[PDB]
Design a protein around this ligand. Sequence first.
Ligand SMILES: O=[N+]([O-])c1cc(-n2ccnn2)ccc1NCCCCCCN[C@H]1C[C@](O)(CO)[C@@H](O)[C@H](O)[C@H]1O
Ligand SMILES: *[C@@H]1O[C@H](CO)[C@@H](O)[C@H](O)[C@H]1NC(C)=O
Length: 765
Amino acid sequence: LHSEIGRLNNQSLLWGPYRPNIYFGTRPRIGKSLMTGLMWGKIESYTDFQHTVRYTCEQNEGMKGYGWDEYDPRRGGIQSIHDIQNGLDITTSFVKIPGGAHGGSWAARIKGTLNDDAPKDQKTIVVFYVSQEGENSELEAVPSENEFGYEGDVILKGRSEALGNYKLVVTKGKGVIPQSDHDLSRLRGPGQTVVQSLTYPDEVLWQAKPILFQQLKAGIDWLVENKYDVADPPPPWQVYLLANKPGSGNVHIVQKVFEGDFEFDILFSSESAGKEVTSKDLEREVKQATEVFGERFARVFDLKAPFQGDNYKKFGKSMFSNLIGGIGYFYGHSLVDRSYAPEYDEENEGFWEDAAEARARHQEALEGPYELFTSIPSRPFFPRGFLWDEGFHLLPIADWDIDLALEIIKSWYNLMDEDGWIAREQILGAEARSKVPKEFQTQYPHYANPPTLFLVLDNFVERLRKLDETLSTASVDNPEVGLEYLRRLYPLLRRQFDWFRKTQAGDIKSYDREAYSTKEAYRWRGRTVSHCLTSGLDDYPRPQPPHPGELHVDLMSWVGVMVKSLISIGSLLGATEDVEFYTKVLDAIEHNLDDLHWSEKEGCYCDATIDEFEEHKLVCHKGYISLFPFLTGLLKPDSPKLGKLLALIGDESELWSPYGLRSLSKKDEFYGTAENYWRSPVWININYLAIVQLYNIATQDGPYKETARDLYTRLRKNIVETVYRNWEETGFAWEQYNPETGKGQRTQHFTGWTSLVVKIMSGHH
Ligand SMILES: O=[N+]([O-])c1cc(-n2ccnn2)ccc1NCCCCCCN[C@H]1C[C@](O)(CO)[C@@H](O)[C@H](O)[C@H]1O
Ligand SMILES: *[C@@H]1O[C@H](CO)[C@@H](O)[C@H](O)[C@H]1NC(C)=O
């Protein structure tokens, strides 16, 4: 039955708008296949189009906003784009129609509305770009009757092994088509939909913009050569209308020009399914998808007081739809340094200088190809997989569709190498690389990241203990299916755990360090004087100078998180020898957190170093790091230490701002210094962990129950209201929030773990 659910899930998830790096485009979960993309831009002059045309996601003053209003990867959804520069509001509706043997069919509606400020006779160029990678695949544009282009629909017929036979149709559409009285029309027509069918080497097919512009440039070259000059120039829009030349090839450009409002459809018909998809099919299924989305949202994300209002519901729908709408399929090679240079061991004082020398050897090479199915922090700024981010992304998604989330977790673990390493940033293929400076592409096998995907697994296990709709919860509804999933994944989880202890081990034995265990101590590799990027808390102040005898309390707490998970999963699988080993490790971490990390003088947890005199020293900077054992759920609900942490969390003069918990204390000497990234701002992922642990203490009998209940109530309200207030004013979720002004700052479109706010509102953890 597991194999059967596997196949059904594959078929359900195959097609999507799985290119979150562009405003709108589709690809299936197949490395080398058919991809589609949308471009538009106003044309007012002979030179402006190259500046106006939209393709890849950005966020600047020329773009008011964009995002998914509704989305489910099984059914599709509706996206809204508000383009100031091009004076357009665009809607892209996408819908999936199951059937046949090849992952089903789909359709899209592209609707453009001129905004109030736009000239009522604006000319807009719109391009639908289609490409196909494959050795034995074919794609052919059926030619038009008319001399110069299409009066009606453009039909592409194609075949691949993965897709079988299919037809893709770009409809004539509704909206005024501008007409030219110029002489050029004798040779190019007066104005009509055109198609160029081209071939290029497979690996450059993703470069849609440069490919389009090269065609446009050859068009203009033709004009000059054929004596169309500045004495009497054709209109700008006609200068930029490609000459019709349809045919076979691995690239097809479908170009339309519109004056005023426009709309057109894209219909993809899997031949192996029933009758071909129609426009009428599209509208019906769109209506149906919205109805289904609304129902699931009210079940899954029941927003509790004081966020029951329609304003908060809209806010929740938007935050959630953008998070789930960010899911992408990525494929290609990665840049990895596989030297394992000895300087990367970081065993000596000054190690950061030795490590940089080794990096400057530039031994990294491309490897793979790999594929990844994942959500992403930010369409415009971070459109790729981040390891510890995904743990947070999947918490809301798992509520929506555990089978989806499990699929994504599986995607991630399928990347793990023989050592147990998964690269913390997944840049797959030349397309993904185009968005990343080369210096920052290289992944290092010694660099870890928080193993937050364990948290999602914890949620899955608890649920397991306690037709799309059916598929979405198949893995919990059929307990044998869930366990089979865990059976396969469990060895990879154990491998990663072992990798942590081999590669991120700290040094107890070689110093004057008394502690309950000689094994349990941990140190993030990859730290510079000012940074520890691998920890995820980029610039949070750590011991100075960096030192091989450092110990990091957050890393140890994550190791705690992992063992707990392996205890739960091992028990389920009856790995008795395993559970006994983990149990001892959990015991050891609990004592060693106290022995090496607890500061009585300061009343919180702390990183450690080794002195100028070779003595163990705590270095305390009060902030998220100080709370880590609490945030990770390692503290007993009656613990005196917990009490002290609750005092720190609730202290206004330290961590507690009107807008949420500051990442660093106002009293810390590093507050608001340097890049001030993790040195004061409020971060929703860490606030989310606090809220969940506060709630936990609040809903059990114990001495801190009422303290936690008060803090839970207020922190939930503070965090939700902060994100909502900014969403209301700016239309954006932000990477972080200013604790003095409440203002969102840094990266826009951070959906992104900011979207956890949907889970915070719906409560009842
Ligand atoms: O380095 N580049 O890619 C880069 C590319 C371009 N650029 C623009 C156009 N083309 N290229 C410009 C600049 C940079 N430098 C920035 C590198 C520092 C890494 C950011 C800090 N990480 C944040 C966010 C997460 O990393 C992901 O949400 C969290 O995981 C983490 O916890 C969190 O602190
Ligand atoms: C799901 O995607 C395709 C469709 O069959 C296949 O190549 C892939 O391996 C499937 N997953 C597994 C592990 O079978």
